[PDB]
Subunit: 224 residues, 4 copies
């Protein structure tokens, strides 16, 4: 009676931790939808002590997953950066690491039919409108977790997943092979192709796994 | 098939977030039990990115609940701090904050029969051997969550829980007054100073604000920008550490016991500025003003175990805390004026015996479900 | 340990209980899939004591739900009647009852975006190839459960769901009117008799109650009473079965095919007695009285598929059902007078093509969580005959 | 928002199926409790189409589990028979089969610490005040499921569990022979009949098969299929219920106490068909043939309690059971032939008192999760 349950899963998506929710498990009204996300995350609060998020920007992001609204997509995906300090749910942009969780989650939730060795998943990003391509290793109707692929920022080794960003060209503007990078915590290669105005492939190897599934509670009285 | 499922609860307990597991859901082999815990939390990792914990010691604490092995206790409770950067599951002391979630957990899981208005849950701490008494508000078979009691560290208000720490008297030491004195005069690099050493919940050393050259109502920014004060308080801390048996040497105390005993400096109730909010706390709302150090640095509020210890000291005739304390007549509450507010503690000590050391906490179940552990990482 | 967990939902779907699973949560290997399904249900075992099924075929049904395999469909849906008594998972037909829960399941699981006050769900049935159209009441991202609608076989009242079988027009024969004619003269051991054969959801034969020496308003004791009427109705049924191409022989029709086509005798709205409560149903409540045989015996109420078929025939001008129907005008519902109450159906036919043939159903989620199946009983044997 | 969630477990316990709820998960108000239970089960309704239960008395059973309320017991267990046909939840007895899931449930839920090979669980049956003891095979913190033990009425083979019903004499009356007699003649609408009433684990009424026009070896279909036998068995049942203080009227007995006492009709050993397989159970394999009625209808196997009670009666010189029983010689086992085969019970009555009442059982968790209940059905 004091609280309400919401189904909810938590993922490591690449170098991030995401909280994953199904479109229908959230309020239709945007005002209430935002209050409820803030309550799940434990925002606004520097410690995020009364909610699921872990007080770092890398561990305070949302993926809402729903039925595809695009004839060429298996699944719709809405990303949000949930502010730690402010009452703000920011829907501006795509998260490349978080989109690495989407495919495996879509398979494990039967939004996409599992095909052994490898399932191609096509993701419709809402914030952008653009399509992403995930190539997912599948074993027994579920996403493979184990294997020998190292990405920097995550201890140990996991099943590789290829993300294709090639149709991201246009992001905000509407206008536009393995190359290294010495980012904050190591190194990272990508399969770029530079040809003026068309992007052939922008593909990189990510990694993901499900950490938890269950129900978050959210206090009713705090939705005054 | 790749991953393994373990039943699991996440709670806010006081100003902490903990993971609450049941005894039987964990392997009995200590060595592998700990490999699982580390895997559940995501350690070792600065970022704890491949686990449930939030990469801060406040959000990296474990609670294993099981059947009571003590005839007066309802539930057994084993605490552990799970290291972030290392592969250690440290079961050493207890944690006063996390214990706040145990009563609500026991009720919601039906370890204890729900009784309306309030359910008394007696918790046997495993790490320590001591009992804690919880007074939980209950409604419709569950622990009440909503209400209008406020605690520092947690936004908003909630339902109160009464945590009595009376049985932790002589925690670290075996005695409420380890030194046998109500005030000890301590030799110091800067001359003699008066100190009062009390051991309830955790050992605490008390000093007059004047004797360390402060008004007592200073601000965290003023206090932390005083290398000289800090060097001095640590010096005093370390000497009493040696004095009460917790280290052989001041170096050892400073290096290997940085946390306990704690040190606080006290004054009489007077008006002061709430640092966090720029507003004035009237001296009429507090029975004394205190400034607690924790980890060679000012604690921005007041630690739970320091609260129980301060209140206990208040009631022992002759301690620095008792001298400074505004007489409370028949009120058993003492009101401690910390930097950002006032925290009440119910404190009854008759004849050197602690009969109540009870503070108000709060707790809330955040999530329930199953954690996943990768089978290959347990090799 | 000893057991493996599988996600799982139990639903009430129409007057049935179904176990609803998701495509990727079952094994791909067909032989192993049926194994796991059977362990879930507790079959074979006449009591089904070691699984979730209720040991009655009403409560031993399966729905596998996964992503759509059809351009116009939101979701794919596979049905199966799990056998109580033998190690068999029977994927033959479809169940208009079980599919009543598909729509709500799809919404509650976010396979179809929730729309208030109502979501249309397009269901692609695997066993059959046809599409089904669910109109579902939604509130706060979920199928409504509470409401004022009453269905027989379910205590109390619930939120109504519209289930449209109009895409099962000519499913069994390829044509709505398997003969081309709205009425046919059929030869009989008792003379010629008029018959209308319509094929929506399932083929039905329709007969004037008068032409079988009935008033049309009798009772399950009275009808089942005289063996001449029972015998004569099987004759007609078996002969039509042959005529529309589903048997080569009356004998074969009535032994290898006793369920379909079905047969009903019909009259205009009238007062008549409900056998279950000696009460009286006014003729203004109904748009025709009708009496349905199923398995050589009177059906005590009305079969789902017959309902959809009857409503359709009623709108096809000429047919016996259509001749005997009360005008409805603006109202698309036709109310059918069966022997223990009045079932309704939404029926629109325009220019020989059927647009709505919709039953009113009800559904509700009963439980969600994890079924356990014991791994040792899944182990692949050399040969397993329990005899 | 239309529906409420209730945590919930389904188990096969022995040869029955049960729903296991924890104490704090059901409302405190008895009337609201009983309305919730009915919604969870789907009652009343011949089909139980809108609830969890299976529309057969053996699949409409409830166990509620809570903390122990008895100084020698690890856990509390309250049984209820949920009526299929009526709005009735019946707490007047124990259930032997269901009680077999209680040990496994208590361990899997951490009310009892798991001990490898075998964990002893002492169980306080609420309804009756008596204690039963269970010995459970544990592996990896949970009750074992897999094994080589066969119990007739459940396909395949499982981990065995030893159930001990020795502390359960006079479960409802306070006396092994509540009338004082081994045999009483009862007045009846068909004239005088001999009955033995024995109260061990639960009270049972034993009758000669022939005194009711049966050969004793009939089939659920054959027995469930004649109204008169059924109406007459209930008359006997109801009358002995009143005669023993569990009811005021015979009408009340059939309406408010339809579960207990139970009634069985018995015969000397004979060949009979096992309805569930079709196989012939040989007369040399049993010591007697019993047909047990439960909820006005044949009990399709045999009750755990009725098993304890039937064996005890076999050892009391004079009872109908005793009269019909093949001499066992040195063997302490009595082999009871029920409709689905054979159940053995180690049964020693030393002239007055029950020293052994022991059987083997088997248990399995089938599903964990949340039942939903429609809020509007409760207002």
């Amino acid at each position: 009676s004091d609280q309400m349950r919401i189904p909810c899963v938590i993922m490591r998506a690449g170098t991030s931790k995401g909280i994953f929710l199904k479109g229908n498990d959230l309020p239709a009204d945007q005002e209430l939808r935002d209050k409820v996300i803030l309550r799940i995350f434990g925002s606004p609060d520097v410690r995020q002590i009364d909610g699921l998020a872990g007080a770092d920007p890398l561990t305070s992001k949302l993926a809402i997953i729903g039925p595809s609204t695009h004839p060429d997509a298996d699944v719709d995906y809405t990303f949000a950066q949930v502010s730690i300090t402010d009452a703000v749910v920011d829907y501006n942009g795509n998260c490349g690491n978080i989109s690495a969780g989407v495919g495996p989650f879509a398979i494990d939730e039967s939004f996409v039919k599992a095909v052994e060795p490898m399932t191609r998943v096509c993701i419709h990003n809402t914030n952008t409108g653009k399509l992403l391509y995930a190539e997912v290793e599948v074993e027994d109707g579920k996403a493979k977790v184990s294997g020998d692929c190292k990405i920097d920022g995550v201890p140990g080794t996991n099943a590789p997943e290829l993300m294709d960003f090639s149709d991201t060209a246009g992001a905000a503007t509407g206008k536009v092979d393995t190359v290294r990078i010495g980012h904050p915590a190591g190194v990272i290669p990508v399969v770029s192709i530079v040809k003026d105005g068309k992007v052939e492939k922008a593909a990189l190897i990510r990694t993901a796994r499900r950490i938890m599934e269950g129900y978050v509670y959210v206090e009713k009285a705090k939705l005054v």
